[PDB]
Amino acid sequence: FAASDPEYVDTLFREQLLEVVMEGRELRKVAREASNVINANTRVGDVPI
Amino acid sequence: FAASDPEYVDTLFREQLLEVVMEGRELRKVAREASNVINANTRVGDVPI
Numbered sequence: 075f076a077a078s079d080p081e082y083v084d085t086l087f088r089e090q091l092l093e094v095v096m097e098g099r100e101l102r103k104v105a106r107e108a109s110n111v112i113n114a115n116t117r118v119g120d121v122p123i
Numbered sequence: 124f125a126a127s128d129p130e131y132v133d134t135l136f137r138e139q140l141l142e143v144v145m146e147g148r149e150l151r152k153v154a155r156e157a158s159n160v161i162n163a164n165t166r167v168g169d170v171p172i
């Protein structure tokens with residue numbers, strides 16, 4: 075009509091894109107504190123009971 | 124196939140045994156506290172009442 079943003083929104087500037095990317099859902103990670111951790115030397119093995 | 128651990132599990136290494144053997148259920152030990160204990164001088168004896 076006059077020059078206005080809604081008309082020229084891709085022609086005379088680009089929309090701002092915020093430089094920070096916003097995180098998704100973050101799961102609770104507890105196994106390493108909540109159990110005994112065996113760093114095994116082999117992929118298969120046994121523990122004596 | 125091409126050399127993979129699931130075909131040579133007892134051919135090119137042994138499976139790990141964990142050196143820690145792991146306990147069965149332990150029962151609750153209380154009788155020596157929960158009772159008057161007589162260290163007897165004889166196998167058979169009497170307490171007077």
Ligand SMILES: [Mg+2]
Pocket residue numbers: 119120138
């Ligand atoms: Mg086994």
Ligand SMILES: [Mg+2]
Pocket residue numbers: 167168169
């Ligand atoms: Mg008697």
